[PDB]
Amino acid sequence: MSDILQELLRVSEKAANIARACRQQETLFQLAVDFKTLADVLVQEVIKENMENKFPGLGKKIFGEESNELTNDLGEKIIMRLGPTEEETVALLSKVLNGNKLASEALAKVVHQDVFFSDPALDSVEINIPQDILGIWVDPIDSTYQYIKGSADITPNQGIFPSGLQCVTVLIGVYDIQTGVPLMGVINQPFVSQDLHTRRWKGQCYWGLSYLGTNIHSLLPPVVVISTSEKETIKRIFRAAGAGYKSLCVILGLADIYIFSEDTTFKWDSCAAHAILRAMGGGMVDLKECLELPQLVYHVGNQWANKGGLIAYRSEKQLETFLSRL
Ligand SMILES: [Gd]
Ligand SMILES: [Gd]
């Protein structure tokens, strides 16, 4: 599914463009009217539509944390369907934004904008996966709170950002419908490095593939350590915002373990990161099951919450080392 994965890298950067666009443009920045739900519902639809456009029959296999439905200020329930032309999308968004024409024409231009983001490494890869066995968990913009606050001035504690826009991630995971094993995953940090003078944000994309014993993943920059959420309350540890980011810390090797005790993460939070951690010999396990190892499945519903928490590990040896102490 390299051709599918290659296409998922594009829409992830297209999703990042929308995420960056809303914050960086005054009309969309200044924004009853729940903008974030709109920003989420829009990004997940753009991914859903673009993949159905390039691979017919994937549209109905793409699941996410948002619906394709928004309730405007009047109480009118609008089915978020974009295109086919740019004009149609402006008429749709104006029905949501009470007839804000400047904001509607702003989003539409970024949504229909072409992006040609292509890894030369993955062009060399020719892997075929049957499309009939694929299911996709999308998280449009993970760390919704941090995205809205928009802190560009946070100093990281030993490589790990406790808060800020660095914690915001676009998560796209692909899994096996029958076995429930994660196969492919894309993570896009829209906000990584901001130039102080031009105020522009540069992002960073990561991916991984684990299909029938073939394991490949994006080139990782160089340079136990445990990461937990800011609301964590169970017994060298770091606080860090965002589910997807804390998972990316394990992938980058900034942290050795990421443990979450509560049941308030779902399939769309973990799936993307899992597939990548799988491609590096690691993975994710049910915490409560380990305390009494098994991997997380993404095909059956408990509904779609990872009940009994999780542990995200890079090395199964480091997992045993950590599980020994506790
Ligand atoms: Gd989200
Ligand atoms: Gd999330």
Author numbering: 1 to 31, 46 to 237, 263 to 274, 284 to 340, 349 to 358, 366 to 389
Would you copy out the relevant sentences from the publication that reported this structure?
Enzymes within this family function in distinct pathways including inositide signaling, gluconeogenesis, and sulfur assimilation. INPP1 catalyzes the metal-dependent hydrolysis of the phosphomonoester bond from the 1 position phosphate of Ins(1,4)P2 or Ins(1,3,4)P3 to yield inositol 4-phosphate and inositol 3,4-bisphosphate, respectively. Conserved secondary structural elements comprise juxtaposed metal binding pockets and define a shared sequence pattern of D54…E79E80…D153PID156S157T158…D317 as shown for INPP1.
We therefore tested the effect lithium addition in the presence of substrate. INPP1 was co-crystallized in the presence of 10X molar excess of Ins(1,3,4)P3 and 2 mM Gd3+, but also 200 mM Li+. In the presence of substrate, no electron density peak was observed for Gd3+ at metal site GD3 with little change in density observed at metal site GD1. A 15.4σ difference density peak was found for metal site GD1, with no detectable peak for metal site GD3 indicating lithium displaces metal at site GD3 and that binding requires the presence of substrate. Interestingly, a 4.9σ difference density peak was found for gadolinium binding at GD2, the equivalent of MG2, indicating poorly ordered Gd3+ in that site. This provides further evidence Li+ does not displace metals at either sites GD1 or GD2. Because we did not observe significant changes in the side-chain geometry for residues that coordinate the metal binding sites, we infer the parsimonious explanation is lithium replaces gadolinium at metal site 3. A partially ordered Gd3+ was found in metal site GD2 in the substrate-bound, lithium-treated structure and importantly excludes this metal site as the lithium-binding site.
